[PDB]
Amino acid sequence: MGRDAQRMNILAGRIIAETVRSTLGPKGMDKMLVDDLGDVVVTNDGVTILREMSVEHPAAKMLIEVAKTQEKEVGDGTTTAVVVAGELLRKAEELLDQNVHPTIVVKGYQAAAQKAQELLKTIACEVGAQDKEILTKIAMTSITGKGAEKAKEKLAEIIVEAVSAVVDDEGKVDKDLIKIEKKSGASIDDTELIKGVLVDKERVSAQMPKKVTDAKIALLNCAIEIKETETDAEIRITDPAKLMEFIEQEEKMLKDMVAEIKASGANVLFCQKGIDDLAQHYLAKEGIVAARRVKKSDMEKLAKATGANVITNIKDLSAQDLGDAGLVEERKISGDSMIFVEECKHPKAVTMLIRGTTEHVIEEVARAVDDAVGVVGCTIEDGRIVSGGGSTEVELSMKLREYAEGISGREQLAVRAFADALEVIPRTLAENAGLDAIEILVKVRAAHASNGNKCAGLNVFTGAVEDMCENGVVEPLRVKTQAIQSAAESTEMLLRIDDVIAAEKLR
Amino acid sequence: MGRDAQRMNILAGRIIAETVRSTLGPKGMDKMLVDDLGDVVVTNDGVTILREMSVEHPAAKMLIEVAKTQEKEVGDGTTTAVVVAGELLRKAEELLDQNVHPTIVVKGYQAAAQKAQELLKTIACEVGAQDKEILTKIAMTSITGKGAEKAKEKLAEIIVEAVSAVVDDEGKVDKDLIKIEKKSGASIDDTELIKGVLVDKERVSAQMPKKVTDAKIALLNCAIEIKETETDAEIRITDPAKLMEFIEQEEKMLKDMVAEIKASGANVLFCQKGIDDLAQHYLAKEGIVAARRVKKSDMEKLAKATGANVITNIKDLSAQDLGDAGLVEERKISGDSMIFVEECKHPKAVTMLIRGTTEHVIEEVARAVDDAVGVVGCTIEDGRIVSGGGSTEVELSMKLREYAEGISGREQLAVRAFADALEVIPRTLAENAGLDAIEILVKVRAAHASNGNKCAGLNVFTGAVEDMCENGVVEPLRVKTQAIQSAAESTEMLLRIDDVIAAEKLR
Ligand SMILES: Nc1ncnc2c1ncn2[C@@H]1O[C@H](COP(=O)(O)OP(=O)(O)OP(=O)(O)O)[C@@H](O)[C@H]1O
Numbered sequence A, B: 001m002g003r004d005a006q007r008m009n010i011l012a013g014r015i016i017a018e019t020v021r022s023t024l025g026p027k028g029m030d031k032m033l034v035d036d037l038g039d040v041v042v043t044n045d046g047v048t049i050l051r052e053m054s055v056e057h058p059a060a061k062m063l064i065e066v067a068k069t070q071e072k073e074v075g076d077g078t079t080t081a082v083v084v085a086g087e088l089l090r091k092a093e094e095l096l097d098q099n100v101h102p103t104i105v106v107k108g109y110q111a112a113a114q115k116a117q118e119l120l121k122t123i124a125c126e127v128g129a130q131d132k133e134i135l136t137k138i139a140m141t142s143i144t145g146k147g148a149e150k151a152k153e154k155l156a157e158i159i160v161e162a163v164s165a166v167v168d169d170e171g172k173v174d175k176d177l178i179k180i181e182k183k184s185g186a187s188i189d190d191t192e193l194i195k196g197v198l199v200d201k202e203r204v205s206a207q208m209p210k211k212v213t214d215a216k217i218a219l220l221n222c223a224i225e226i227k228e229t230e231t232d233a234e235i236r237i238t239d240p241a242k243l244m245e246f247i248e249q250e251e252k253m254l255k256d257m258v259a260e261i262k263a264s265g266a267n268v269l270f271c272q273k274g275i276d277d278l279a280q281h282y283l284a285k286e287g288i289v290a291a292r293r294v295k296k297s298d299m300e301k302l303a304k305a306t307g308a309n310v311i312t313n314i315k316d317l318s319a320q321d322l323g324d325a326g327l328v329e330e331r332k333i334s335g336d337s338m339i340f341v342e343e344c345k346h347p348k349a350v351t352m353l354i355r356g357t358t359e360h361v362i363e364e365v366a367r368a369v370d371d372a373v374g375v376v377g378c379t380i381e382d383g384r385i386v387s388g389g390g391s392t393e394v395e396l397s398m399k400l401r402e403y404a405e406g407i408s409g410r411e412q413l414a415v416r417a418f419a420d421a422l423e424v425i426p427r428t429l430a431e432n433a434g435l436d437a438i439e440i441l442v443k444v445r446a447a448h449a450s451n452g453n454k455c456a457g458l459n460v461f462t463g464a465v466e467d468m469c470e471n472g473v474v475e476p477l478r479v480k481t482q483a484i485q486s487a488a489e490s491t492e493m494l495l496r497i498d499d500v501i502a503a504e505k506l507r
């Protein structure tokens, strides 16, 4: 009973752990996912694989739940954490044949995790905020498995210039709002960096100007038209010449309503609903930008950038509830028509537009930008950049072997197993090639046996061995520490189960 | 085809390799062997196990043939060699999963064997011929799995005093003739060391003396009686009074024949055949020892000890074909009657008699004496006594790990595997106990990580760890080097087979 239900839980986890094994290197194979209706999709990363997966077995759920909590942190060390956890489980499964029972292995892993975390903090350097040439290599190496055939130089010079705006001034809080729009076009790969406001909404009546200098943005909500809500106090009619007079008065009231806004100092009208065609001419004889259908996601970016308040009615508008803009234009680019408002006041956030050919290419960039800025915000606030490319694990493996010699007991085999399991990263990064096999792992192991030589690792774009800091791979340390912590926490939630029962009571 | 016939040859060898695994330690279990007729025997060693074994499979024959050639050398490193070979095969079977094919492993083993042989010659000391207290510990530790409940002190003081006779004078050639007789008795365990000649033959006529001082041994073969062979030249008869006269003359000729031997200087008569009862009185009136039925194995020890020649006839005896003795006696000890001739001339060989209770105890000593002198003759001629008890393998394992770091390539995994396979001796010597398990191997591994500390090993008569040279375990180095050579030669005769065919032609 103790050994029957224990091996099944490990066998059920090793199947889902080795699924994202091939999707780890920069030049690895993709995954084809089909559905019952007939939706064939292609996924190259490992985050989407863990979501759309048959979680019918209880063992194939806790690991995914743990990985989802770690992916929402930095979003980079998700697949490697699952690979390390699977390697640890496979290494610990063989150690159960000596009849020692799972207990000392957990203590050994807990003792080795602290040593690894202490050693990782001593193999890094100090990166200040006055650098610039160092902050671009991390952005260049962040886009490898997504699509290096078009994103390797153009997408590495516009992210650093866009993020470095409020992070260098305040190195603590830099929570921005970055929105990526999924739209196609006709070009190969075009990247636009809008330094203003982007509105994704067209019109139907092209009878309004689209070039106003130093215009002012005025945010107006509802309660503007004649009928939009309801009225509890009902009215009555007496003479037929009174209703027509009231209608004419309510129609002419719009003239003075627009004149008041013009005299207050505003030339841009942003309404939540739609603007009637009869209210356009009144906005054309005065030079006021007419717009309609403003999404809340696009409207919330106007109060913190231009500087204006909202009006719940129509008679609550004065002079302090106005903003300031630069140039509002409506160009037809990439098929659809979008509104560009340039020169605001406080350039906090930024907008990035990607134009490709079909429809699956732009989406491929949608999962690449969010994973490219996340490695930047954790760089200025920290600065403990280590040597990426599978060099930290090999360096820690040479130290754990000599550190485990100072202790005596059955806990040394656990530390040795944890140290040997760290060599799975170079084996997976070299399996995608053909001229690597196993000689690369032997050559990179005896190279770090001297005094120095630490930045050397492995690159799949050459074949030989060289330094990683001189090429352009500078993976941070947080993405490794969080991955190691997740792997050490997930490997203990399965060995401490042993038996499994069932019940008919909810919760 | 290449991987189908290869795994079967290893699986057929691993079954016969792990059979003598339990029969290695001093306090291990025995083996019960049955036959078709119904012969149930008990064997504690591993040499007899390899002989009486079903060799119906071709893989289970070459290893036995190789072990038989090594057992005839010193007769001590036979079971351990098979254990090391099986461990090497089991370790190399797992390495074939990476698809490297057997080739570099053989080169790695050949490179590691030379390094091990060079390191073994540097961890020994110098033992001269003037020692005495050191030469008894090797004889005491040679009898452990045979029967330490009666052989641990009495059998450790009579072997050194018997071997040290012609070895200290000539330290090169010491080929002697040691014969062990299998006879029972009534005592618990008695050991007699005869410093002369022992004859295992009784009589039927107890009418001859058995106490003659400074007697002389005269070796006489056949051609003594009246009729023993044949005659081609036939004779005839003429008068009846002639045949009786010839018979009387031939009968009286024996009187002068014995008188001539008495005048020549001889009192002991050793004949190959039997002596008639009528020829006894003629040997009683002169004081001559009468004996009959002398085996060739007991007769060949008279020409090199007493110093006498043989006579093919009867008239070829003069005075130079005589020997010299001391005291010839015929005592009835342990049931049977044996002849003891003490005080010879050149005490070259020696005779050892073991008296037990039943019939299987004495035989248990028969397989213990030959394995106790063989470790002595190789001690004076060599003198490279190392620390026994499973301490040389652990010492070489710590050196091979650091020696394999100086090379690069796929040959390092073979050296590492060969080094890790050497740790099977302490695991087998500690498996027979209960309070050992695996902690002993971990404790004896980190103890040799300092500068000195080399004589420490493992003893099954205490439980803790201490030095082996101070207890009484001094296993020589030749029994280890020959075992390592046999294990390295036997592991290459199976991996170089791959495919196997058949034919109908003899040879
Ligand atoms: N040129 C390179 N040389 C060495 N290693 C590289 C190189 N490019 C990328 N890598 C490695 O690839 C890894 C990233 O792989 P990829 O972006 O394909 O998926 P991932 O981001 O690991 O997926 P997840 O975020 O789900 O873990 C990094 O950890 C990095 O070490």
Ligand SMILES: Nc1ncnc2c1ncn2[C@@H]1O[C@H](COP(=O)(O)OP(=O)(O)OP(=O)(O)O)[C@@H](O)[C@H]1O
Pocket (backbone or CB within 6 Å): B023, B024, B025, B026, B045, B046, B047, B075, B076, B077, B078, B079, B080, B081, B141, B142, B144, B145, B146, B388, B389, B390, B429, B458, B459, B460, B461, B473, B475
């Ligand atoms: N007190 C002891 N402490 C440690 N090791 C011991 C002790 N006594 C014996 N041994 C080990 O036991 C081994 C001998 O075992 P045993 O005599 O039972 O069979 P064997 O002679 O090895 O059989 P074979 O001659 O077929 O190999 C020696 O190699 C020695 O190292």
